[PDB]
């Protein structure tokens, strides 16, 4: 019973191969401190937010919406946060995501009791997971690009704290 | 619901089962401390306690001792800790002489040999932990001040 990702460590007790994105990676034993299902919901929430965050970084490089250049002159990545707190955009997104989090909080209590799977909000309008085999690989891919986007979001925002360039402007201007 | 109950089902023993006394969090911390952790020899219990205690001892002597404003402050603080450690080891030794009858049992703390094991571990660990703190403070300017190097 050895960890797959860390061959010299014992398999983490609270972790199981049924979980999506499982590789046996918990060398610190944090899956025992907090409940594993709370951790799964927290990780999936972090995954989806950082996926939007990374795509938002990239897209805001590629283009901006009509009239956005009027409001934001030179602010690029996190400067646009500072100027759009003045304007109403950030407050609007905060209000509506907090609206959604209220029902997300009900759903977290629901998944704590055991009625709901973590990160499961039954949001499949286009029937992507209907086959039942795609659904598993989609869960795995969601966690994979979710983890990668957490690392990427950090790695761009810190690249921008250094240079000010932003992701595509960092690449094109080496 | 009631959070306070008699201690280990016994209403007439001189103790209570309170959340500080018997919560899962408390039980965890107590059971995993070097004094109570399973699978530890008394010598190893002494080493882990000694390393912990010796390490923190250096700091108050260094920062607040008589030679604190000198450049020999860390040397004086270490030797002050070393003197306290030696005095404490004498206290440990005399406790063992007067508190435990001589029996073959050595894997328990409250035995004559097991106390002598624990005392041996504590002295080595205390000097080791104080020496480690000496090395860290000597080299790192953040530790020499209170973090005041940044301001």
């Amino acid at each position: 019973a050895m960890s797959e990702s860390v061959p010299f460590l014992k398999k983490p007790e609270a972790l199981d191969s049924s979980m999506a994105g499982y590789a046996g990676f918990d060398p610190l034993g944090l899956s025992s401190i907090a409940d594993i299902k709370f951790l799964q919901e927290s990780e999936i929430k972090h995954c989806r937010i950082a996926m939007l965050a990374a795509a938002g970084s990239i897209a805001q490089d590629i283009f901006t919406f009509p009239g956005v250049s009027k409001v934001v002159g030179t602010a690029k990545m996190t400067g646009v946060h500072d100027v759009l707190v003045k304007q109403g955009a950030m407050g609007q997104i905060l209000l509506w995501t907090s609206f959604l989090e209220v029902f997300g909080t009900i759903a977290l209590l629901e998944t704590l009791d055991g009625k709901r799977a973590p990160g499961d909000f039954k949001f499949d309008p286009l029937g992507f997971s209907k086959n039942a085999e795609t659904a598993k690989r989609y869960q795995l891919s969601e966690i994979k690009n979710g983890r990668l986007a957490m690392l990427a979001t950090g790695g761009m925002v810190h690249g921008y704290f250094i240079t000010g360039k932003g992701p595509l402007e960092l690449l094109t201007n080496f | 619901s009631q959070f306070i109950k008699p201690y280990n089902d016994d209403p007439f023993v001189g103790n209570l089962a309170t959340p500080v006394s018997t919560s899962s969090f408390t039980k965890s911390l107590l059971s995993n401390l070097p004094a109570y952790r399973a699978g530890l020899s008394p010598l190893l219990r002494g080493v882990e306690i000694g390393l912990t205690h010796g390490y923190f001892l250096v700091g108050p002597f260094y920062k607040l001792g008589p030679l604190r404003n000198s450049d020999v402050a860390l040397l004086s603080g270490f030797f002050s800790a070393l003197g306290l450690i030696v005095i404490l080891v004498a206290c440990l030794t005399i406790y063992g002489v007067v508190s435990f009858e001589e029996t073959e049992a050595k894997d328990q703390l409250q035995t004559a040999k097991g106390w002598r094991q624990f005392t041996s571990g504590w002295l080595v660990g205390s000097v080791g932990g104080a020496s480690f703190a000496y090395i860290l403070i000597s080299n790192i300017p953040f530790l020499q001040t209170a973090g005041m190097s940044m301001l």
Binding site: - | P66, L67, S70, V72, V89, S120, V124
Partner: protein, 162 residues
């Protein structure tokens, strides 16, 4: 009490023998060491401003310990810390300063042990008695002649060291 190998026992005899052999080495070593001036700033008087009132001596000139004396004492402090750690946490094989309480005492040697020229206990005890006698002899010789111990050791050895 005294049934742990302390007092006038062969355990104490052996232990004091070992310390006096080391002490004869250390006395010879310091005689040679300060004869050639290899103790740095040997006369330089330590300042209470740096070291505090433990450095004071009240000799009329300087009112402070010399640096040579402090250096010799710090050397002794090195071997005292070793001594404490070896007394309380000895090695697995090392002869212990204290004893089990029910130990069998080694048989007393007598006037002279069997001449076993090896790295033996007989050689250790003979040389230890000789070194303890030598310590006393050197002390008395220096006191009566009026000379320093360092000079007395040099003269006994034929001024080889300095």
């Amino acid at each position: 009490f005294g049934g742990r190998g302390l007092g006038v026992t062969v355990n104490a005899e052996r232990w004091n023998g070992r310390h006096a052999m080391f002490g004869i080495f250390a006395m010879v070593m310091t005689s040679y060491m300060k004869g050639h001036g290899l103790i740095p700033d040997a006369d330089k008087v330590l300042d209470i401003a740096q070291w505090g009132p433990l450095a004071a001596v009240w000799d009329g000139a300087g009112n402070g310990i010399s640096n040579e004396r402090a250096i010799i004492l710090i050397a002794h402090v090195h071997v005292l810390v070793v001594s404490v750690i070896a007394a309380i946490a000895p090695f697995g094989f090392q002869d212990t300063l204290v004893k089990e309480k029910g130990y069998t005492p080694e048989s007393p040697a007598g006037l002279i042990p069997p001449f076993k020229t090896g790295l033996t206990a007989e050689a250790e005890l003979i040389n230890g008695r000789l070194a303890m006698l030598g310590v006393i002899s050197i002390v008395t010789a220096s006191l009566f002649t009026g000379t320093s111990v360092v000079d007395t050791i040099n003269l006994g050895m034929g001024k080889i060291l300095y």
